[PDB]
Amino acid sequence: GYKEISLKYGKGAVDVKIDENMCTVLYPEDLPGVEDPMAEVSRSLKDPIGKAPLSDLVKGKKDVVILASDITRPSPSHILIPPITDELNRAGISDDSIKIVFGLGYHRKHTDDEKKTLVGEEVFNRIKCIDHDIDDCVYVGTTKRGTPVEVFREVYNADFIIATGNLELHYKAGYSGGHKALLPGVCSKNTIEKNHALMFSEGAMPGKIDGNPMREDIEEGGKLARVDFIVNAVLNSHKEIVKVVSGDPIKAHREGAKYIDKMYKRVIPEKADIVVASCGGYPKDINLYQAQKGLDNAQYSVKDGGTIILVAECREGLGEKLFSDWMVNAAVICEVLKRADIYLISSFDRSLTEKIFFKYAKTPQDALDEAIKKYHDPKILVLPYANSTLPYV
User: Fold this and answer.
1) What is the DSSP string of 145-183?
2) What are the Lactate racemase C-terminal domain coordinates in residue numbering (predicted)?
């Protein structure tokens, strides 16, 4: 036994020493970003998953709409959109038959400069770039979960809809991308409101599609809006494009989700009694609110009655105002995970750490030594990069 594992903590690192036969250490396999992203887009458009290529699908269309967004940054639009329009032009579709719609959801409209940023100045000059108008939607049906689907008129009017965006793990929708570009981004306040209520279901969790009510509602509303085709950028932890998937809004998305899974999903035979999770260093552990991203990932791998040891400096404090005010009087995950014990190894003192219901230890080793005593031959799981590593049972 007695393996030494170093865990990132703030701007440095700290060691923990574990019986090697008691523990297992899971690491992400962060792929490097492609050397030529636009060429990668072109590759995947010749290689569409679950659909014939754009060449065969858009013949004779006159109102192609491309969905882009920067609700989530960094947007891939300026890389994905030009190679798409190249394919449309190749198939005989002129720039007057092409339209780009930005999915605002609840957010404010874009300035001209911000639109040029999102699509590139050359696309902006050739092709109309239109902000979602949340007050100009058209009802197209209700999902089986009761979400009325009211789509922006520009999108409703289209004879062909190409959804673009990122594809990564999402803490509620399981994964981003696919039909998510349409629902709720270019839908009405009603669609956005009711769909968002599914966030609080028990199956709204990262890495889960089937049985995820939020993901299922999204893909359903997306299907009532008849999204035709997706182009999605698979990102790594540095938000670099490692892969592009194109084609059927369902099948292409599943392919993208397997690439994410190859990088970040670490399947686990059962839940551990002790989980040691580092956020991976400053500034991912800059404050407790941000450290939650590590804890939200570790929460699925600890047993009922288990112990999480969260290694996160939080030099800048509790973080976001509404989250912090809740902890001392958005925080949802911490509240859920309190069927286990949580040690916080941080720059906080014991009094503050305990005031927010964490257990306190000076170092991770001290926390693990006291936790190990509370269990009979505990299984120990160590997540050195918990902000991107998803243990999955």
Assistant:
1) TS-EEEEEHHHHT-SEEEEEEEE-EETTTEE-SGGGGTT
2) 270-384
Considering the domain architecture, whether residues 210 and 328 belong to the same structural domain is answered as: no
Evaluated on CA atoms 306, 312, 316, 319, the torsion sign reads: negative
Q: How was this structure determined?
A: X-ray
Residues 164 and 292 reside in one and the same domain: no
Give the total number of structural domains in the chain. 2
- Residue 323, classed as helix, strand or coil, is helix
Same domain, 256 and 315: no
Whether residue 37 has a cis bond before it, omega within 30° of 0 = no
What region, left, alpha or beta, does residue 207 occupy, with left being phi > 0 and alpha being psi -120 to 50 degrees? left
Is-contact 256 290, C-beta < 8 A?
A: no
User: What is the extent of the structural domain holding 352?
Assistant: 1-32+264-393
106 and 226 in a common domain? yes
In 10 A of CB 202, how many CB atoms? 9
Please indicate, yes or no, whether residues 259 and 321 belong to a single structural domain of this protein: no
- My answer on whether 320 and 205 are in the same domain is no
Which residues, 6 or more positions from 55, have their beta carbon under 8 angstroms from its beta carbon?
87, 90, 91
Q: Are 281 and 10 in contact (CB under 8 A)?
A: yes
Q: After which residues is the chain broken (C to N over 2.5 A)?
A: 329
For residue 373, the 8-state DSSP code is H
Contact 305, 336 (CB under 8 A): no
List the one residue out of 137, 227, 226 whose CA is nearest residue 189.
Answer: 137
Domain boundary among 211, 237, 263: 263
The Cα 132–Cα 155 span in angstroms is 9
Q: Which residues contact 178 (CB under 8 A, 6 or more apart)?
A: 163, 167, 218, 219, 222, 230, 232, 249, 250, 252, 253, 256
**What number of other Cβ atoms are within 10 A of residue 60's Cβ?**
10
Neighbour tally for 274: CB within 10 Å? 27
3-state secondary structure 211-249: CCHHHHHHHHHHHHCCCCEEEEEEECCCCCEEEEEEECC
